[PDB]
Symmetry: C5
Subunit: 159 residues, 5 copies
């Protein structure tokens, strides 16, 4: 609950070739999350795309979510995994976070989410790609919104 | 004014290989839509271009519109589609949105529209490319200007 | 006219293979025109360059002008067309716009001009490349500073006057 | 706070093919380090990646750190090097700087670190790769935070090699 | 202070294959020079690098300087010219500008310099690469810091 500035979250969930790694940023209007969202939607290159995540055709998740790949997409199969299972899991995770109140419903129309997904070339099981990305995204959102892991917590784990 | 902050719209219209998916951003002077517009016109890479959309030679649509592709343009054919039917449909959608009261005419000279078009490699029918991008762009503008869909609506419909 | 905010202009001028299409943005210090100018000079890639336009060696045009290609530069022939005739045409147009008062002389040191140049692979006549890019840039500057075409005008002619 | 503006640090540490060269920027929320962090995480290309540095799985270092390679990653081994020892050395350095108070712990949740890593393709000793990046990062962080070297100091030494 | 806003400089110095062309931006904290410096350090790609210029190992010139290439670096020989003689010339130019009073010593820790270099791949004499880049860089800093050429001056020479 309550997001008044940029927050970063990250998670690794799953196993095998479909394991899902997610880097995430969320922030309000007027912040760098908003400018990076706009620039990120406009700037694409060979192998590296970005899209406005939707949970169903003509139904984008809210808050506005820009999803982009961190592992290069070199053929139709990798693209399909990105736009099908992975997009669906990320989008569902964002909307469920609003449904559950992790992202407050009254801020949801004024926030931006940036989601970097890592889908291995070896991934093949769509049901797992979808599920693991859904879980890694939901986890990254809760960690980002609650500011975790806290500095001191991580500090006292290196010494 | 009606459009006082950055808004994002999206739509998927059509069928077959010419189906049009549009990602759209609209915003006023002083907003990130303006900065994204300037950076986007300046930064291009092989296969990924951007241009100031026009209705006809020497007749840009207003509000100022930056159209850019989201599917790599690998050959001349795709490029002719981008610059021909797709650009015409996008530009017509923007001007028609002003005409239909979707974008207030008194704000037109002070807004920026960013339109990401997705033209499949298999797309081949020019008339459909134009028509569907026109329809998906206009619907994306309509939605963005009104903040649609609202989070509660998506949450509910989820 | 006086330039206190970001203005956008464009023009298509000429015929044959050397036809020039210019997309242009002009703006003051503190505006996104300035930030895109700085990032644009810094960020280059294979086949896509940007340069600080000059009218002569060691003599850039003012206001500061960042020119960048829209068509991939695949060989020396195209790099020379970009750096030779197109650059000279663009730079001359900016400077002439200042000499003519279109860009006021008392603002020229505080503006930034971003110019996207589209040179078709078929272009071959250098005098025409230079001429048409000079004209299209001059025309784009005039349209940008005067805010032309006004939305009301384009709306009335969207179907054609 | 102690780190109230953007600071830049750099360091070259180690020997051999594992020698580590680190370019580093650190700064608070609202500064260009935050904007460059968000953009840098979002914008990747063939051979040039960026990642949120972690000391362990599901355990990112704090302050938030964006690590990116300066040498094109063309094969799988360069990637393992980048993601394995390099990342680990960098991430440890950042946490240790917080532990030692170089980066105050009461602001570690409000700063961003940008770390550019250079790894020659001839590097092979994961053990060195990791220690040199750890040391180069740690040095780069204290140099940035303390504003070293001062301009006056560099000016004095600009001639004596 | 003397450098209180973003300034742009350029110069062409030398002859043969080692001729040096420099495009340059300099500016204070809080200016777009600072933001372009940070973005430019982060964003690199195949053939196009950026680095924090140093006079010697562990000795960066000050003001903080981001040097980047404008000509594609395709092989190890071009990379060595970039990181070796060109970098040394650029870094010495920045430090000498401070020593010669071109950049105020008391502003040196608060400025950012962005230097774009154009090394022809045919360039072969390292001493000339270093000398011409040093000369073009110092001249570009001198021009930028003083706003030269002034528009009236270029207009008169045109
Ligand atoms: Ca880029
Ligand atoms: Na409407
Ligand atoms: Na001087």
């Amino acid at each position: 609950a309550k997001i008044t500035k940029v927050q970063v979250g990250e998670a690794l969930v799953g196993d095998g070739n479909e394991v899902a790694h997610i880097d995430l940023i969320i922030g309000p209007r007027g912040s760098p999350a908003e400018t990076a969202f706009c620039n990120g939607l406009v700037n694409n290159k060979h192998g590296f795309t970005s899209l406005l995540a939707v949970i169903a055709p003509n139904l984008p998740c809210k808050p506005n979510t820009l999803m982009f790949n961190k592992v290069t997409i070199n053929d139709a199969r990798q693209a399909v995994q990105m736009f099908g299972p992975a997009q669906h899991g990320v989008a569902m995770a964002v909307q469920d976070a609003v449904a559950e109140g992790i992202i407050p419903a009254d801020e949801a129309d004024d926030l931006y989410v940036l989601v970097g997904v890592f889908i291995h070339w070896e991934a093949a099981d769509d049901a797992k790609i979808q599920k693991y990305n859904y879980e890694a995204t939901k986890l990254s959102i809760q960690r980002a919104v609650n500011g975790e892991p806290k500095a001191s917590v991580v500090t006292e784990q290196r010494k």
